[PDB]
């Protein structure tokens, strides 16, 4: 029944793997068979970790190039300024709210990951001058091949901006050559998102092996911590709607009660599909009967479907704290502010494809000194990606909801 396995829903598939993973570890580990799990069940979980790390490098480079080549055009108009400034402010405030939830609920506190029998000891910090000057790569190819992600981000952003200037050039041969290069890079990004969909089909098997191995060694309190981070994200998402969207709507005069009733179809549709790109046709229909002018929502909505992601920004702030707390490290004031800047940039480049927001988490992990090369970081990294399907549902609703409420405010003031 191979076809039956594929057609079965992914979220219900992961939940089955997690429940049986806990049961197997407890009963088998109680009878003094812990080494059997480590020798046999662990290798099936190591494949999931290695598969996740492969997708990190091609996705970051390709998505940033195409993302930077679309919002670069300065000429937008008068309705193209209010929507842009609103998008940046909402994304920045989402990260701050996520930090508050992480510092309040304190997820991941109690477990000490010691993969390889070595506690995570942070390396000595080089001088700030060296760190800032190391962002510029000496060899753009070398940064991509060696796995350095901070130089990769800088080169991708400038390359995308330069492509935009070429497409507006007067010469016909230069314009044709610039469009071909962008399409080739665009086709690489789209091909990688299909691999992400195929990797998550193996996720229920990978989650089963990971949970079973950790259940027989670090007891049961690990599962309790996973519940705290799941509750922390959804609590923060709820406060995002009531304390930001509802307040702004009431201030400008738009009735929140009428807003939710007229936009319920979009939110539930985005919830089940977990995609903000396939929900766009549904979003276009909803705004029509609301009263928005045809021109207003024909420009902001396509732009906001890939730029305005408040849920992803809140998710990345909470997830980073969970990994650091599990490792036993401490976040300084300067490092926390670095999250507020890196998470906003990472959310802009994130694509609407489901599951693409946990691949950009590596951008903020490296920015705070937690590389994926460290075995301890990688083990904890795959722990939060295992339950990503559960968290992917809620965050997609907030991303779509921000686009609708942003359009209404602009349309109110014309
Ligand atoms: N699924 C989200 C993207 C993400 O989770 O990163 C969306 O469609 O907006
Ligand atoms: Na935003
Ligand atoms: Na969005
Ligand atoms: Na995005």
Question: What are the chain's domains?
Answer: 1-414 (1.10.3860.10)
Nearest-angstrom CA–CA distance, 75 and 132: 31
DSSP letters spanning 255-273: -HHHHHHHTHHHHHHHHHH
Spacing, Cα 304 to ligand 3 middle (Å): 5
Q: Which atom of ligand 1 is nearest to the CA of 270?
A: 8
Q: Which residues surround ligand 4, an ion (CB under 5 A)?
A: 306, 309, 350
Largest Cα–Cα distance of the chain, in whole Å?
Answer: 76
Q: Are 69 and 184 in contact (CB under 8 A)?
A: no
* Token representation of residue 208: 């089963």
Tell me the structure's resolution in angstroms, rounded to a single decimal. 3.0
* Token representation of residue 15: 């939940």
Q: How was this structure determined?
A: cryo-EM
Spacing, Cα 178 to ligand 4 middle (Å): 23
User: 265: exposed, middle or buried (C-beta count within 10 Å: 0-12, 13-18, 19+)?
Assistant: middle
* Token representation of residue 65: 């190039």
Nearest-angstrom CA–CA distance, 322 and 214: 17
Nearest-angstrom CA–CA distance, 267 and 246: 15
Nearest-angstrom CA–CA distance, 69 and 80: 16
* Token representation of residue 331: 């976040």
Within 6 A (CB) of ligand 1 lie 274-276, 309, 312, 350, 352, 354, 356-357, 392, 395-396, 399
**Alpha carbon 57 to its chain's center:** 15
Query: Ligand 1 pocket: which of 270, 278, 353, 402 to mutate (most atoms <8 Å of CB)?
Result: 353
Nearest-angstrom CA–CA distance, 66 and 221: 43
Taking residue 316's Cβ as centre, other Cβ atoms within 10 Å add up to 28
Taking the CA of residue 220 as centre, how many other CA atoms within 13 Å lie in the half-sphere pointing to its CB?
8
Nearest-angstrom CA–CA distance, 403 and 328: 38
Spacing, Cα 343 to ligand 2 middle (Å): 11
Nearest-angstrom CA–CA distance, 334 and 223: 31
Residues in the chain: 414
Q: How many Å is the Cα radius of gyration of the chain?
A: 22
- The SS3 call for residue 177 is helix
Q: Which atom of ligand 1 is nearest to the CA of 360?
A: 6
Nearest to 38 by CA among 112, 100, 116, 99: 116
Nearest to 267 by CA among 92, 405, 400: 400
Nearest-angstrom CA–CA distance, 33 and 14: 25
User: 230: exposed, middle or buried (C-beta count within 10 Å: 0-12, 13-18, 19+)?
Assistant: middle
Nearest-angstrom CA–CA distance, 341 and 92: 8
Nearest to 227 by CA among 308, 144, 305, 322: 322
Q: Which atom of ligand 1 is nearest to the CA of 352?
A: 8
Spacing, Cα 87 to ligand 3 middle (Å): 9
* Token representation of residue 242: 């009531």
């Amino acid at each position: 029944l191979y076809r039956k396995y594929i057609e079965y829903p992914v979220l219900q598939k992961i939940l089955i793997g997690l429940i049986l993973g806990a049961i197997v570890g407890l009963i088998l580990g109680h009878y003094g068979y812990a080494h059997a799990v480590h020798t046999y069940v662990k290798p099936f979980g190591d494949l999931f970790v290695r598969l996740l790390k492969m997708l990190v490098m091609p996705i970051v480079f390709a998505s940033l190039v195409v993302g930077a080549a679309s919002i670069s055009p300065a000429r937008l108009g008068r309705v193209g300024v209010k929507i842009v400034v609103y998008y940046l402010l909402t994304s920045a405030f989402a990260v701050t709210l996520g930090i508050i939830m992480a510092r309040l609920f304190n997820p991941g506190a109690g477990i000490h990951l010691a993969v390889g029998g070595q506690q995570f000891q942070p390396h000595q910090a080089p001088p700030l001058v060296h760190i800032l000057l190391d962002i510029v790569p000496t060899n753009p190819f070398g940064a991509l091949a060696n796995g350095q992600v901070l130089p990769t981000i800088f080169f991708a952003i400038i390359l995308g901006i330069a492509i935009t200037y070429l497409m507006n050039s007067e010469n016909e041969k230069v314009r044709k050559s610039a469009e071909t290069l962008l399409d080739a890079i665009n086709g690489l990004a789209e091909a990688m998102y299909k691999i992400v969909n195929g990797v998550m089909q193996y996720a229920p098997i990978g989650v089963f092996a990971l949970i079973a191995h950790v259940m027989a060694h670090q007891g049961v309190h690990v599962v309790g911590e996973l519940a705290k981070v799941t509750a922390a994200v959804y609590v923060g998402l709820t406060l995002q709607i009531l304390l930001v969207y509802f307040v702004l709507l009431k201030i400008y005069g738009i009735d929140p009660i009428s807003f939710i009733k007229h936009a319920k179809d979009a939110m539930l549709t985005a919830f089940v599909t977990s995609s903000s790109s396939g929900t766009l046709p549904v979003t276009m229909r909803v705004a029509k009967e609301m009263g928005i002018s045809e021109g207003i929502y024909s420009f902001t909505l396509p732009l906001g479907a890939t730029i305005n992601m408040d849920g992803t920004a809140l998710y990345q702030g909470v997830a980073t704290f969970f990994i650091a707390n599990a490792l036993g490290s401490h976040l300084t004031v300067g490092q926390q502010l670095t999250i507020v800047l890196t998470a906003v940039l990472a959310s802009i480049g994130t694509a609407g494809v489901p599951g693409a927001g946990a691949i950009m988490l590596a951008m903020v992990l490296h920015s705070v000194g937690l590389p994926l090369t460290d075995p301890n970081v990688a083990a904890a990294y795959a722990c939060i990606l295992g339950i990503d399907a559960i968290l992917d549902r809620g965050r997609t609703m907030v991303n779509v909801t921000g686009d609708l409420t942003g359009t209404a405010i602009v349309a109110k003031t014309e």
